[PDB]
């Protein structure tokens, strides 16, 4: 009965005590510089200490355009595509997040409430601004030039700094975690004119002759040390630590003009957010190829059937700007989509135009029970 | 004072409603028309659950048919696509009755930044003004047609978490009335030298500008699946018996270097005040004002400030300045509440006063249905 | 199983209501407008007695302003005067949410013949198409204006004698919502070579066709003078707590000679299924299909049939055919899985064009739960 | 009290037993061929046997157009006007139906659910179709030509094959029934251009020179023989046999534009159906001269106030097509109009246009108690 109500209360209290008694630490775990032509997949081994909240991954790169005459220009995702995929496994080898660099980056932005680690432009005469180039990439790389890029990704375990749901307790020696990073290479980073720019960093007539010179990464692990001890050992939020907070993405196809394309939510998960990217056969449009988007439950009842601009308006309230062309966001944080609470639910897109090889790339943020 | 009990209960009921019901935003009406034929519409909301507000989307195409002269956006621009709004609840009681520009400025004050705007940053990832949510061409050249988009949020409930002012509409069949008066060919275009206050574009080609058409879509935001208990629906009675309204007014009689005082009425709890100094058609960036203040009779000013310092307080609220001649005052944490008519007044001591000068006031307030 | 008692009571109450109340059909709203300005309307029904449904009359004048080219009716024609309909009851629960053409096809399936049509006979007495109840010019020549009339029945109650799905509205003041989205100058006319699925007319002069105006009148059908007993109103509680809805969906991913399966959801008791094979804008009379069927996982097909034989079953239901539109009657034994996808609707296509898809339409019963 | 409830039950049981035990028979009663220029009124004497359900009357005719140059064309009612009036009296000389051939025919159609005895057109390659010309008349009869017509009318006593309400027990020797048939003649059958075509069969510029050559009728009597006998003699549905099921028609005038023309129902009768023919001064229009039609009760409360097309829609659900121009039908079979059950009721027509000599021809189908 009220056995869980007491469980919930115990969890929250334990969380509050851990946060107040422990001290946060962020420390470098590993750094490596390489040429992706040699190797692009790396398995980083996080340190086993206290409760792990997440990882901040710094990525830098140098790209050279050796085309004789043509330039290349940033794609809509640009440096967010420096990391193609990220996968994390905890000490019990349970997989948490497994998604694309672009999806992880869009969630980082959604959680910040503004473009992740960006520098806002203001009229201040004091010289604040893009001083440190935290996330940066040249808009174009001309024939014969070399550009430098910097990108950051936060790989979460814990939901936030104050909500430890999804965090990982790593104090078991001989049982390691694994943070796998799959980086871009010359094949994924450069798209020829007319090719699909989805996974690319630069696109243009000089693409065939573009090459990475090097990529470097530094992984910083954020955790809580000096865990509080009481009468039974460590005071720990048991629900928090046995819940997985994950990001995952998938691709759905089968769109036809003026027909509702419905992507069912894969039940049991508590979906906090949904990102839908309309890759219209390599074309990414600013809503003009869509009639409306919506979230619908078993009853054909729509809770937010909106035209594209109005849908975008809701997102502007969340991140103070629009996501790139063809990228749509839906916040369900306060009331996560959870089938079994109200029948099957689906994310809906009714397309106005559908090109060949059209598809919806879905990105989800969700909570689910461990084991 | 059984009030503590009433408030304690109200707040608990509000939380149960927010926790148990489910939010819905739904289109209730769309229409396209030519301002030459009509510009006043009465939208009928759906009578379902607890209504929180209405999101009104307005799009328009404006053609500058002038032979050689262009026109440029006024300071309010697309915010003048809707001239006025009035809302009547199922009990025939009015809530908001104000201008489109005042409604828009409050939307901005409540968001803490220009309403539904896209902030500019150094991000290399292509975030930005991708969807043109609120948009209008800076100028429309002779012979050109410009496309505009504007959004307004007409609030009933104070916010997503504070249901004060919300309307229970699952109640009687009696209809709600959301009245909208749109800009027309007579209000949208101002000739050079004319007052641009209510206009969208001003310039030498104004006389030959016209609307090709205007379209609006109203979305209703409400809470459905209301929680039921012993006695029935669990409802925040104080929230639902309180009105959260925006209203505007105009005052004249300004004289150089003399305090011009606009009295606040009693009974109303004023959350914010906006004062626009329409200096005879000229809108200046504080240079025509000595100071502004809020004053209580026999207790002097609580914030007598020079225009720039007054603007500094506003920058802390919306992260930028409101347009020229528009002044904002936040009293949300401690609402102006006189108890005696005029115990408190809004003050403007003008430096220069042109012919036909006046202050256009805008208020946000709470008041009991009594 | 106190269900027998519940059902026994429900049925008795239904009969008392039908016997004691009096049927009323009443106009609730009429409006004339220009699609260029607006095409979406929210009609507010009257909250009185037990509501059975709404008869929606739609008239329109279409002008072909093209200089020299005509246009001709698409296969659905005036059935596309209404693009979509949605109904919300006083409790904010949705019932039907579907397209105008699907609603029309169900109206036909329920009548047992083309809805509100005039059958042709050899009678010398001048019966016939006298009143043009549902009517539209086969073609509208360049410079001409055609007049159209269309009717749709939006059901709440299943029929005149089965009140399952009906709505009690004498109840709270909370309003009902009948949302109607009409055709407009962007949906009603299809250019040669364009998909005519949602259009009314198609042809060389389409780009210059436009609505002069559209008018609609909604009539509400309900039962008044409800019978009262000891405890009060004698009402069929099962009927009134059950939803009778029509809904549509779209599915894509068809491949030549491969079974394309559209799963039925659980909980719903599906009375009928309509599948439209929009073969990339082409609508064929079964020639692009190998067979259609309804199948249960691990129990094979209950009716795997060639297109003509499938059509033969439909001819027994509506006395004619319904190009590219396929119907399936499961009224006596509704598809009810209990487990999502235990049953699916199957189409094995012979030829699949670019942008092919199946537009599904369903009639079902489900508890308000 | 429940004395009638037991009476109703006894009646139904008796009816069920009669239907199951007796055997239906349909037999010719009389046939005659004549020239209506000689005689047009005939009193047919039905045979007194068992329970009589009704009469099927076959009528054929030959018409010649001897005009020098002009043709004539069928009116909207055409062959339905071969019989002008029909009147039936039972063995006690109680009158049952007394109405026009056209009204009787429209009720025959309403009861069939389709144009009476018509042949439906289909795509069948097998040669079904109008093979036997059961009801038939040439669309036109050219100058100098002779056309042949066939018409059938069912004169009901019993309401239907299964509901014996209105049937007549005729087993009393020396007490005969009377079926009076008043046929068309040269005066009623042919209308000149511009004349009122209501009662005519053909109208056209050749009308003055049209003549019947002959008319023939054959009356078939439908009855139940071998009536079941029990403990008290014949088992008979006493309520059924003492109830009259009749058709009657009348004409009402006094119509003025945009004003409600109300025809009150003549109380006590249980009106099963109502037919209203808007003879607008000889003009019969397809609803264009009417604003709306309705049935209204004492309370100005309308139960079905409908525009003409919507009214027609309800009729299309009943007979699968529309009745001829200016003919409107109203079904009240399941809940017969019965004043004394809910105040006075009226049939309403609000005309948009009213020509000189305009009138409403009302046709009623009803049940009433005998004696």
UniProtKB/Swiss-Prot annotation, chain B:
One GO CC annotation: viral capsid
The entry's keywords: Capsid protein, Virion
Cytoplasm found in the keyword field: no
UniProt superkingdom: Viruses
Short name of any one Pfam family annotated for the protein: Phage_Capsid_P3
Major localization listed first in the record, in broad terms: virion
Subcellular location per the Swiss-Prot or TrEMBL entry: Virion
Subunit structure: Homotrimer.
Function per UniProt: Major capsid protein self-assembles to form an icosahedral capsid with a pseudo T=25 symmetry, about 66 nm in diameter, and consisting of 240 capsid proteins trimers. The capsid encapsulates an inner membrane and the genomic dsDNA genome. The major coat protein P3 and two assembly factors (P10 and P17) are needed during the assembly of the virus particle inside the host cell, when the capsid protein multimers are capable of enclosing the host-derived membrane, containing the virus-encoded membrane-associated proteins.
UniProt-recorded name of the protein: Major capsid protein P3
Name of the encoding gene: III
UniProtKB/Swiss-Prot annotation, chain C:
Pfam families named among the record's database cross-references: Phage_Capsid_P3
Signal sequence coordinates: none
Localisation: Virion
Keywords: Capsid protein, Virion
Coiled coil: none
Record's GO cellular component terms: viral capsid
Gene3D superfamilies: 2.60.120.20, Viral coat protein p3 (2.70.9.30)
Keyword Iron-sulfur: no
UniProt-listed InterPro entries: Phage_PRD1_P3, Phage_PRD1_P3_N, Viral_coat, VP_dsDNA_II
Role this protein plays: Major capsid protein self-assembles to form an icosahedral capsid with a pseudo T=25 symmetry, about 66 nm in diameter, and consisting of 240 capsid proteins trimers. The capsid encapsulates an inner membrane and the genomic dsDNA genome. The major coat protein P3 and two assembly factors (P10 and P17) are needed during the assembly of the virus particle inside the host cell, when the capsid protein multimers are capable of enclosing the host-derived membrane, containing the virus-encoded membrane-associated proteins.
Subunit structure: Homotrimer.
Name this polypeptide is given: Major capsid protein P3
Origin species: Enterobacteria phage PRD1
């Amino acid at each position: 009965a009220l056995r869980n109500q007491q469980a919930m209360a115990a969890n929250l209290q334990a969380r509050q005590i851990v946060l107040q008694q422990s001290y946060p630490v962020i420390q470098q775990v590993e750094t490596q510089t390489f040429d992706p032509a040699n190797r692009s997949v790396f398995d980083v081994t996080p340190a086993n200490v206290g409760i792990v909240k997440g990882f901040l991954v710094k990525v830098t790169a140098a790209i050279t355009n050796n085309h004789a005459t043509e330039a290349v220009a940033l794609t809509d995702f640009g440096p967010a595509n420096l990391v193609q995929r990220v996968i994390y496994y905890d000490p019990d080898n349970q997989r948490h997040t497994e998604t694309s660099g672009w999806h992880l980056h869009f969630v980082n932005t959604a959680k910040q409430g503004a473009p992740f680690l960006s520098s806002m432009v203001t009229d201040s005469p004091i010289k604040y601004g893009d001083v440190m180039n935290v996330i940066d990439a040249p808009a174009t790389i001309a024939a014969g030039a070399t550009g430098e890029l910097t990108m950051y990704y936060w790989v979460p375990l814990a939901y936030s700094e104050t909500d430890l749901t999804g965090a990982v307790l790593a104090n078991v020696p001989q049982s390691k975690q694994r943070l796998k990073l799959e980086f871009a290479n010359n094949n994924t980073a450069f798209a020829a004119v007319g090719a699909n720019p989805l996974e690319a960093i630069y696109q243009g007539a000089g693409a065939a002759d573009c090459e990475f010179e090097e990529i470097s990464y530094t992984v910083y692990q954020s955790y809580l040390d000096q865990l509080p001890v009481g009468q039974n050992g460590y005071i720990l939020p048991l629900i928090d630590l046995s819940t997985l907070y994950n990001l995952e993405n998938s691709a759905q196809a089968g769109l036809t003009p003026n027909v509702d394309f419905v992507v069912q939510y894969a039940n049991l998960y508590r979906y906090l957010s949904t990102i839908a990217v309309f890759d219209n056969g390599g074309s990414f449009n600013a809503g003009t190829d869509i009639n409306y988007l919506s979230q619908r439950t078993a009853n054909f009842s729509d809770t937010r059937k909106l035209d594209p601009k109005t849908w975008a308006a809701q997102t502007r309230r969340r991140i103070a700007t629009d996501f790139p062309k063809g990228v749509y966001y839906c916040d369900n944080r306060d009331k996560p989509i959870y089938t079994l609470q109200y029948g099957n639910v689906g994310f809906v897109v009714n397309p106005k135009t559908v090109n060949q090889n059209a598809r919806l790339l879905m990105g989800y943020e969700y909570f689910t029970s461990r084991t």
